[PDB]
Each structure stands twice: as C-alpha cells, then as structure tokens.
Amino acid sequence: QFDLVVIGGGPGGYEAAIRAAQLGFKVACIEKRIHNGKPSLGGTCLNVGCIPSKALLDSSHRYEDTVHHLADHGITTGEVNFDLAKLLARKDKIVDQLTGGIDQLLKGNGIEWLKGTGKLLAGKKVEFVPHEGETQILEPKYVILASGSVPVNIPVAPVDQDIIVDSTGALNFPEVPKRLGVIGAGVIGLELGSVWRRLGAEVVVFEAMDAFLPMADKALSKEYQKILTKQGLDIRIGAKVSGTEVNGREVTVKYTQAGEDKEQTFDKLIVCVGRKAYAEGLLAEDSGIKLTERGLVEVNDHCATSVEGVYAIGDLVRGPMLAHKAMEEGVMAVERIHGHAAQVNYDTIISIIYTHPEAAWVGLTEEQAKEKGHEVKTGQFGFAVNGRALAAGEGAGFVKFVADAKTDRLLGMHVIGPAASDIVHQGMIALEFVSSVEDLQLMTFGHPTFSEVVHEAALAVDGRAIHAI
Amino acid sequence: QFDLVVIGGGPGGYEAAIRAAQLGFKVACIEKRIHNGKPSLGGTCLNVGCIPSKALLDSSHRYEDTVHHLADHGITTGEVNFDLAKLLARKDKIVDQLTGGIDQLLKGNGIEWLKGTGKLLAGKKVEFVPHEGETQILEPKYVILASGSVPVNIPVAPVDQDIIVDSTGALNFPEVPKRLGVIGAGVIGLELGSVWRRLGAEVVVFEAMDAFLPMADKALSKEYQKILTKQGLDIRIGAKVSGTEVNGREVTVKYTQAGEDKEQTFDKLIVCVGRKAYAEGLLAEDSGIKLTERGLVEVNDHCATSVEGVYAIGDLVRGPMLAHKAMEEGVMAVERIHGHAAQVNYDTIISIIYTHPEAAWVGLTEEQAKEKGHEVKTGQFGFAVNGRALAAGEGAGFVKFVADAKTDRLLGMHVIGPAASDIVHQGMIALEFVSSVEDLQLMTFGHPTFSEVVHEAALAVDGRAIHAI
Numbered sequence: 035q036f037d038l039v040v041i042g043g044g045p046g047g048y049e050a051a052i053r054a055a056q057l058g059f060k061v062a063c064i065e066k067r068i069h070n071g072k073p074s075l076g077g078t079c080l081n082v083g084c085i086p087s088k089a090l091l092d093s094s095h096r097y098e099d100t101v102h103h104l105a106d107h108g109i110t111t112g113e114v115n116f117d118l119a120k121l122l123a124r125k126d127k128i129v130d131q132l133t134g135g136i137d138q139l140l141k142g143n144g145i146e147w148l149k150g151t152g153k154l155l156a157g158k159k160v161e162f163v164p165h166e167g168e169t170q171i172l173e174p175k176y177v178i179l180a181s182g183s184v185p186v187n188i189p190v191a192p193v194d195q196d197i198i199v200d201s202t203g204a205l206n207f208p209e210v211p212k213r214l215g216v217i218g219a220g221v222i223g224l225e226l227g228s229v230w231r232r233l234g235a236e237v238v239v240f241e242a243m244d245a246f247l248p249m250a251d252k253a254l255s256k257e258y259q260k261i262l263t264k265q266g267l268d269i270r271i272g273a274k275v276s277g278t279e280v281n282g283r284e285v286t287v288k289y290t291q292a293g294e295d296k297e298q299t300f301d302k303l304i305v306c307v308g309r310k311a312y313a314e315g316l317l318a319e320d321s322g323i324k325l326t327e328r329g330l331v332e333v334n335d336h337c338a339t340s341v342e343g344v345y346a347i348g349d350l351v352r353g354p355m356l357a358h359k360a361m362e363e364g365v366m367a368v369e370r371i372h373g374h375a376a377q378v379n380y381d382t383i384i385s386i387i388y389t390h391p392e393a394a395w396v397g398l399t400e401e402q403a404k405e406k407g408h409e410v411k412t413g414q415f416g417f418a419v420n421g422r423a424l425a426a427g428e429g430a431g432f433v434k435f436v437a438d439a440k441t442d443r444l445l446g447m448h449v450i451g452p453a454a455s456d457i458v459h460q461g462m463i464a465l466e467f468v469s470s471v472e473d474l475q476l477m478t479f480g481h482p483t484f485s486e487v488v489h490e491a492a493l494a495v496d497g498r499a500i501h502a503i
Numbered sequence: 504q505f506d507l508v509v510i511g512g513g514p515g516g517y518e519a520a521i522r523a524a525q526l527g528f529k530v531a532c533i534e535k536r537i538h539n540g541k542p543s544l545g546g547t548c549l550n551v552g553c554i555p556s557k558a559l560l561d562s563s564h565r566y567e568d569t570v571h572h573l574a575d576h577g578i579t580t581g582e583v584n585f586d587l588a589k590l591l592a593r594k595d596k597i598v599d600q601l602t603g604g605i606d607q608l609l610k611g612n613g614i615e616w617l618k619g620t621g622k623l624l625a626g627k628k629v630e631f632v633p634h635e636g637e638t639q640i641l642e643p644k645y646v647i648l649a650s651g652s653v654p655v656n657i658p659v660a661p662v663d664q665d666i667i668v669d670s671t672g673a674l675n676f677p678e679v680p681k682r683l684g685v686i687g688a689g690v691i692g693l694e695l696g697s698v699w700r701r702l703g704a705e706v707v708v709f710e711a712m713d714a715f716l717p718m719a720d721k722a723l724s725k726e727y728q729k730i731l732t733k734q735g736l737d738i739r740i741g742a743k744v745s746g747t748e749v750n751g752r753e754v755t756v757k758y759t760q761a762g763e764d765k766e767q768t769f770d771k772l773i774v775c776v777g778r779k780a781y782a783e784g785l786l787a788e789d790s791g792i793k794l795t796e797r798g799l800v801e802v803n804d805h806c807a808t809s810v811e812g813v814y815a816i817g818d819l820v821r822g823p824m825l826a827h828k829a830m831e832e833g834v835m836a837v838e839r840i841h842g843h844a845a846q847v848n849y850d851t852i853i854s855i856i857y858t859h860p861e862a863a864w865v866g867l868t869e870e871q872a873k874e875k876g877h878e879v880k881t882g883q884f885g886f887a888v889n890g891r892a893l894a895a896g897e898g899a900g901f902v903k904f905v906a907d908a909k910t911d912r913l914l915g916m917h918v919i920g921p922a923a924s925d926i927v928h929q930g931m932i933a934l935e936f937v938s939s940v941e942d943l944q945l946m947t948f949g950h951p952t953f954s955e956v957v958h959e960a961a962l963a964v965d966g967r968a969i970h971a972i
C-alpha cells in the first residue's frame with residue numbers, strides 16, 4: 035500500500051521519492067531503465083547524460099592539458115598517449131558506483147523501487163508492469179510524473195547508433211573519429227564536440243539558428259564563441275542540415291548556408307539539437323491530465339497538474355531542462371503535497387557549460403532586464419590580470435553583473451572563467467537574498483582567489499574597481 | 504603637495520591610495536622595497552608572499568598530477584621531468600608583470616609613488632628619504648600606516664638565506680633539496696613544504712605547539728592533518744627546536760618532543776614560525792602614537808590610531824595577517840577619513856590554505872560558537888559521493904556548517920576539497936546576509952557541481968541530506 039507513487043527514477047523522481055519518505059509517506063518509485071543488463075536509477079543525468087559527459091570532459095581536459103599546457107611550467111613528458119577504452123571504462127565505473135548509490139539510498143529510506151513501467155490511470159490509480167511478473171494496479175492518493183526527456187529527432191539525419199549517433203552513442207565511440215560533425219551548438223553539442231576535439235577529432239559544430247546561445251547574455255556568448263573557436267572548435271553558424279548520405283564508414287552532410295547548398299563528409303555524426311519531453315505510455319486516455327500543444331504536461335508554478343494530487347516535474351514540464359531544476363521541482367511537489375508552500379524560484383536557476391574554461395550564468399541577461407522595464411547598469415572585470423589566474427595559467431574570461439540603476443538591485447551574473455560553475459553560486463546566493471550591488475561591494479573576498487574578480491566586477495558596476503585602468 | 508600620505512605599498516597601502524584617489528584626494532604612497540635590483544610596489548603579498556607561493560604551488564601540482572594522476576584516466580607519458588630554473592622563471596615573470604601593473608595603476612589614478620622610506624614625525628609630518636634624491640618633509644592632512652610584516656626570527660635557526668632560509672629563500676632554491684626540514688606547521692609551512700615535496704624532497708615539518716592548526720575547526724584540522732600526512736608531509740606535533748647545526752652543506756635540527764631529545768639532518772631548512780608587525784623607521788619618538796604589548800600600533804575597530812588623522816592597517820595591526828584583511832582595512836580607513844562610518848566585519852574574514860586539496864573556512868568554529876553561548880548544531884557532507892568530484896577524480900574532503908540550534912542562524916563554514924577557496928565565499932556571503940540554515944536549504948544549487956555539497960551539508964544540519972547513507 036503506497037501513499038505516493040513516483041513514475042520515473044531520474045533526478046526529479048528519486049529526489050521526490052526520498053523527500054516523501056523523509057516526510058512519512060509510503061513511497062514507490064517506478065523506473066524502467068536497464069543499463070548494461072542492470073536495472074538502474076539516476077535517469078538521463080546519471081546514465082547517459084550529465085555524469086558521463088562530465089567524466090569525459092575531465093579526462094579529455096587532462097590529456098589536452100598534458101600535451102599543451104606543461105611547457106610553460108618547465109615540465110616535459112616525452113610521448114603522451116591515451117587509451118580510449120580505459121578512459122571510457124573509468125566513466126562507466128563512475129556511473130555504476132553512483133547508480134548503485136541511489137539504489138542504496140532508496141532502500142535505506144524504505145522506498146520500494148518497482149522495476150518496470152508505470153502508467154497513470156483514472157482516479158489516480160497506477161498501472162505497474164514489471165520487467166518480470168504480474169502487473170499491479172496501485173491506488174495511491176498522490177502521484178508525481180517524472181518521465182523526463184529523450185533527444186529531438188531530425189528526420190533527414192536519422193540515428194543508427196553507428197555512423198549517425200545521438201548523445202548516448204557520442205559518449206561511447208570505440209575509436210576517436212578523424213572527422214566529426216555535430217548538429218546543434220547548444221550546451222550538449224559544445225561539450226561533446228570539445229571532448230572529441232581534445233582527443234584528436236577534426237570537429238565541425240553546426241548551428242541552424244542565426245544566433246549562438248540565444249538564452250545567454252550577449253556579451254557572454256560573443257566572448258565565449260570567440261574563446262571556443264580559438265581552441266579549435268569550429269562552430270558553423272547559419273547552417274541548416276537538409277540531408278545526410280551514409281556511404282560505408284562515412285557520412286556526407288548536406289546543408290544550406292548563405293542561400294547555397296553545401297556538403298561536408300565526416301566519419302561520425304552526432305545529432306544533438308535539443309531534447310523533448312518523454313511521456314510514451316505515461317498516461318491512460320482517461321487520466322484526466324491536460325496536455326499542451328508542444329507535447330508537455332501542463333502544470334502551474336508549483337508543478338501541480340489539472341488533476342488534484344498529481345504533480346509533474348523535470349524535463350517533462352516547462353522550464354530549463356536541467357538536472358537541478360528537476361531535483362528542486364521534485365522536492366517542491368512533495369512539500370506541496372504535504373501542505374508546505376514550497377516554491378522554486380525560476381529566476382535563480384543556474385546554467386553551466388562544462389567546457390574549459392567553463393561558462394555559467396544566473397538571473398537576467400542585460401537584454402532581459404531591459405525588456406522587463408529596468409533602467410540597467412552593468413559592470414564586468416576580467417581574469418586576465420587576476421593574480422590567482424596568472425599563477426594557475428587561466429587568465430581568460432570575466433565576471434559580468436547586471437543591475438537596476440534606480441534601486442541598485444542585483445539582477446544577473448554571467449561568468450566565463452576558472453571555477454565558473456562554483457563562482458556563479460555566489461551570485462545565485464546573492465540573488466536569493468535580494469542583494470544590492472552595494473552589499474557585494476561591502477564584503478571581503480579572499481586574495482589571491484578567482485572569486486575576488488566577483489568583487490571587482492561589483493565595484494565596476496559603479497565604475498570604481500580598484501585594479502581597473 | 505598631498506592630502507593623504509600612505510606609508511607602505513603593500514595590499515593595504517596601495518588599495519588605500521587608489522580608493523583615496525577615487526574620492527578626490529591628492530595622494531602619495533611611500534614604498535621602499537627594492538626587489539631584483541629595481542623599486543617595486545605590491546609589498547609582501549606580490550613580491551615574496553601570496554603570488555610567488557601560488558605560482559610554485561600550481562607548477563608543482565601540475566608536476567605531481569602528471570606523474571601520479573594520469574593513469575586512472577588512461578593517459579600515459581614518457582619520463583616526466585621539470586627544469587627548475589624555468590619553473591622559477593615563470594614565477595618571476597608573473598611577479599614582474601604584476602608589480603609593473605600596480606605601478607601603472609597608481610599613475611593612472613594620479614597617485615605619486617615616492618620611492619624610499621617614510622617616517623611619521625610629530626604633528627602628522629612625514630619624512631620622505633628617497634633612494635636617490637633630496638630628502639623632503641611632507642605636511643599631509645591624513646596619514647595611513649601600512650608598513651606590513653616580516654618573518655618571525657629565531658636565534659636558534661638563523662637565516663643565512665642559503666642553507667637556512669625564510670619564506671623568501673624557500674621560493675628560490677636553485678635545486679630541489681633531497682631532505683627538507685620546515686620549522687612551523689602554519690599555512691606558510693604547509694604550502695612551502697608541499698611545493699618541494701611534490702618536486703621530490705623528503706619533507707619533515709616541525710610544529711612547536713601540541714595542536715595542529717588550533718584556529719581551525721577541530722574536525723577540519725583532524726582530517727586535514729591525516730590528508731597531508733598521507734601525501735608525505737611528516738608533520739611532527741609538539742616538536743620544539745632547541746638548536747641547529749650547520750656542517751658544510753647539511754644542517755642538523757636538534758629538537759625535543761614527547762620528553763625525548765632528538766635530531767635529524769637535512770640539506771635545507773625553512774624557518775616559517777609566523778610573521779610579526781614591521782615598524783622599523785616608521786615612527787619618530789615624538790609621533791604621538793600609542794602601543795599595546797608585543798609590537799603593534801594600537802587602533803580601534805575602524806583602524807584609527809591615538810593621533811587624529813592617522814590610521815594604521817594590515818599586518819601592522821591586530822587581526823588575521825591576511826592580504827584581503829589589509830586591503831579592506833585600507834578602504835575602511837580611507838572611507839572613515841572621508842566621513843563615512845565604514846566597518847570591517849572580522850567574523851566574516853576568510854582563511855585559505857592553498858595546498859591540494861585546498862582548505863578554507865570562515866566564521867566560527869564549533870568550539871568558538873559554544874564558547875560564545877550558542878546551543879550548537881552542525882552538519883557535514885563529503886565530496887567522496889559527489890558526482891562532479893568523482894568525474895574529476897577529486898572525491899575527498901567535506902563541507903561542514905556550524906549553526907545555532909535555537910535560532911537556526913548560520914555561524915561558520917569549514918571546507919576541505921575541490922574549489923574550497925571559491926566555495927567558502929558562498930558561506931561568507933550567507934554570513935554577511937545573516938542567513939539561517941533554512942535559507943541555504945531552500946536554494947537551488949547546480950548539478951553536477953562541487954557546490955551542491957554545500958546544499959547537502961546545509962540539509963545535514965537538520966539530518967535530512969537527500970544523498971546521506
């Protein structure tokens with residue numbers, strides 16, 4: 035007998051299950067994934083997404099760093115080699131450890147992991163079809179839909195798991211492709227392209243839109259594109275793929291650019307133009323759940339669906355398709371079910387791109403602030419002259435703040451540089467506390483540290499950074 | 504002619520000068536240092552302190568990582584070697600670039616750098632004795648004393664800057680010593696010891712006191728001692744040096760620990776038992792400035808001396824001997840001179856140790872909180888299970904929070920691990936905003952990041968971390 039049934043065992047689903055167990059609910063988490071013959075919790079994030087991509091980014095970064103960034107330190111290595119199979123096996127081991135860890139967490143919280151598929155029926159009943167055995171009809175009072183996402187498909191570039199792959203296949207190439215095409219220049223394509231480029235592939239990253247990273251602050255995307263291009267990442271803009279032709283162990287990409295039909299041949303092609311909500315087999319025709327024209331489950335600000343007691347979260351519903359967004363939505367849904375007015379602040383959700391250097395941002399871009407009626411003032415300071423960055427040999431990028439000129443209210447923070455993914459949390463925290471730019475100016479930041487650039491950027495908003503020319 | 508005269512061109516002094524110039528004052532900064540044959544600003548921090556030590560820590564960390572932490576990633580190399588002269592030259596070039604940078608900042612701000620010594624005479628008069636030129640007596644309205652510090656000297660281990668060196672010589676060894684003795688297990692000794700150990704030295708560190716890092720939280724110092732010892736730093740607690748003996752190119756350290764007289768021989772010995780205020784040639788006998796006990800210029804909370812119009816900042820006065828403390832006291836002194844009730848919060852000053860892994864803390868330790876009357880609750884979470892840390896091969900250490908059990912007020916943060924120097928700024932900001940533990944619990948931290956360990960530790964304070972087994 036379960037009070038709450040969660041359909042989906044990804045970041046959203048398992049976080050919700052754990053929080054519910056902490057609050058006294060009798061919980062079931064239904065998750066169908068079987069990864070290399072083992073049922074596995076963790077969703078996209080752990081099994082074929084965030085974690086594996088971060089592992090390959092770290093290993094490939096170490097390789098590039100060893101070949102190209104040791105000479106200035108007076109360090110020599112002679113030959114430098116990588117064994118791709120060992121590099122990939124390390125990633126697989128990390129994934130195994132982490133998915134085993136979540137399984138242990140559910141067991142420790144007294145949560146039952148139902149291995150199989152779940153479907154929401156009328157009256158909030160849930161059909162559980164196990165991998166092996168008798169189908170069960172559960173009758174919970176509450177249900178959290180957390181079915182996540184899958185890759186967007188491009189009909190003219192069909193994935194075959196061999197020459198043309200999606201992000202899953204891109205994390206598993208058995209050899210480094212000599213020529214690699216990547217369709218999509220969002221966070222996923224930039225990261226996957228960087229991994230293989232560092233390991234020796236000649237990479238072309240296609241972006242069909244006329245703009246690079248459209249949701250990022252324009253100053254950030256402009257500088258970031260410049261930085262990635264400088265590293266050898268060939269980002270091709272205004273290129274719309276119109277067809278593909280697989281001939282043996284090669285694939286030719288036909289694309290339109292500047293009104294002309296062009297072509298380029300690659301050894302492997304990655305299709306990563308985004309992800310879409312996945313809800314196949316999620317809802318019975320009489321579930322009573324309202325859908326949107328774009329394929330999402332409709333919810334309000336608190337993730338509540340049209341059916342009382344049924345919440346929907348993560349990549350399945352509106353908002354940035356990020357792991358932490360799914361996790362906090364899971365917690366919010368459970369707390370709401372339990373009567374607490376929990377709320378995710380969608381204006382303080384962090385975005386990170388794990389390239390090197392990293393890019394990260396939170397809050398409003400300069401354009402968004404202007405669009406929303408703010409009289410805007412901005413300020414930025416670079417890592418180029420930062421003592422810590424020079425010592426580390428990582429003097430590139432900057433910290434930019436967006437603020438209100440009338441109230442001095444901090445509205446957004448945009449960063450490219452060392453420790454960007456952890457530095458952006460400083461801005462996120464300041465935003466949660468409704469910080470003014472002055473609040474940050476009055477604080478003592480450690481010296482020498484990458485973080486003091488944050489302080490200098492705060493001073494620069496009012497044109498008074500100490501170390502500015 | 505000058506409104507303000509600052510005696511000392513270290514972080515405290517030049518920071519004060521620039522702020523003063525921004526506020527419209529005509530400023531003179533008197534700095535005597537002659538480094539590598541020419542006059543140079545930046546003080547201890549830039550010339551023989553923070554910056555050069557950070558450069559060597561980074562290069563030595565690269566060497567160690569290349570020898571020992573590439574195999575797990577499937578990366579192999581030929582025989583790894585380092586050219587010590589070139590490694591040191593890199594550090595020297597970074598210091599030269601930075602010192603030149605400060606010089607051009609003073610000129611850009613319309614500040615006159617007087618190259619020579621300064622002395623506060625009666626009636627706020629200041630005697631400038633240039634290195635080359637006529638001596639002049641200036642009559643400013645305000646004076647800031649920022650003469651800084653120098654190492655503590657111990658007649659038992661006299662510095663010849665060859666066999667027995669202080670922190671300055673320790674940053675310039677012409678060859679890696681096979682056996683290195685380090686007197687002092689403070690931040691500086693742990694860092695200098697780590698540099699040379701990484702480069703091949705067999706290192707022993709003597710600490711006179713019965714405790715390791717007594718100002719740190721006990722849980723942090725305990726784990727940190729274990730980590731550093733396992734790396735190869737033989738940290739000898741309660742080891743009091745009674746004498747040194749130099750025999751040719753070797754030095755025997757005689758010392759007492761646990762009741763027994765012992766000795767060991769080394770190729771080099773570093774003396775870094777702390778730093779003391781430096782005020783030689785700073786004050787005329789009739790300057791009118793008050794003193795305390797050991798050797799500090801007495802000042803109130805705003806760095807005001809007993810003489811109206813005269814302030815004293817940085818290592819010259821009470822408080823943590825840190826660059827950022829000097830920097831903030833310099834800005835405070837200048838804003839007080841200008842009429843504003845500026846204030847430095849000494850309970851939010853960050854301490855960082857730049858070993859690998861890094862250690863960092865801010866606020867109250869668990870013992871300090873109890874001493875001040877708080878009913879204390881604590882929470883901690885480790886990087887060992889953090890996905891980002893596993894991906895990076897940095898899975899060690901933890902984040903620990905100290906908080907009041909009755910009011911939920913956050914009191915301190917203590918970190919060992921990846922990005923510690925930057926993660927600790929998150930705690931610093933939360934303390935500046937008078938954060939409760941619940942405030943941090945309700946925030947969305949990015950996933951996967953080292954920073955989400957902060958969130959888990961906040962939740963662990965109330966025994967509800969989602970990922971705690």
Ligand SMILES: Cc1cc2nc3c(=O)[nH]c(=O)nc-3n(C[C@H](O)[C@H](O)[C@H](O)COP(=O)(O)OP(=O)(O)OC[C@H]3O[C@@H](n4cnc5c(N)ncnc54)[C@H](O)[C@@H]3O)c2cc1C
Pocket residue numbers: 041042043044045046047064065066067076077078079080082083084085087150151152153180181182183201222312313314315316347348349350355356357358360388950951
């Ligand atoms: C290559 C790549 C890299 C990424 N990198 C990052 C990053 O750096 N940072 C970041 O924040 N995000 C990243 N993401 C996105 C992140 O993985 C998702 O935002 C996150 O996994 C969404 O979590 P979720 O719980 O909503 O859905 P999912 O993680 O997709 O989990 C849903 C789970 O439910 C299961 N399921 C679906 N339907 C049913 C059913 N009817 N019955 C039983 N089980 C079902 C699925 O098997 C799936 O495992 C990345 C994604 C990819 C593909």
Ligand SMILES: Cc1cc2nc3c(=O)[nH]c(=O)nc-3n(C[C@H](O)[C@H](O)[C@H](O)COP(=O)(O)OP(=O)(O)OC[C@H]3O[C@@H](n4cnc5c(N)ncnc54)[C@H](O)[C@@H]3O)c2cc1C
Pocket residue numbers: 481482510511512513514515516533534535536545546547548549551552553556619620621622649650651652653670691781782783784785816817818819824825826827829855857
């Ligand atoms: C090896 C080492 C590593 C360190 N690492 C760190 C770290 O990681 N983080 C950190 O926060 N701190 C660190 N410190 C400490 C830091 O360098 C000091 O706290 C900081 O430099 C203090 O700045 P200041 O302006 O008070 O004095 P100083 O930096 O000492 O500057 C004072 C300057 O004034 C000059 N002077 C003195 N008397 C006169 C006079 N009468 N006339 C003219 N000039 C005069 C001196 O020559 C000196 O150049 C380190 C120190 C050392 C030795």
Ligand SMILES: [Cl-]
Pocket residue numbers: 184185186200201222306308309
């Ligand atoms: Cl994808």
Ligand SMILES: [Cl-]
Pocket residue numbers: 193194195196198199200201202203204
């Ligand atoms: Cl695939």
Ligand SMILES: [Cl-]
Pocket residue numbers: 250251252253399400401402
């Ligand atoms: Cl913008």
Ligand SMILES: [Cl-]
Pocket residue numbers: 715716717718719
């Ligand atoms: Cl201490």
Ligand SMILES: [Cl-]
Pocket residue numbers: 719720721722868869870871
């Ligand atoms: Cl303690």
Ligand SMILES: [Cl-]
Pocket residue numbers: 794795796797798799
């Ligand atoms: Cl005294």
Ligand SMILES: [Mg+2]
Pocket residue numbers: 272
């Ligand atoms: Mg066009």
Ligand SMILES: [Mg+2]
Pocket residue numbers: 470
């Ligand atoms: Mg306020």
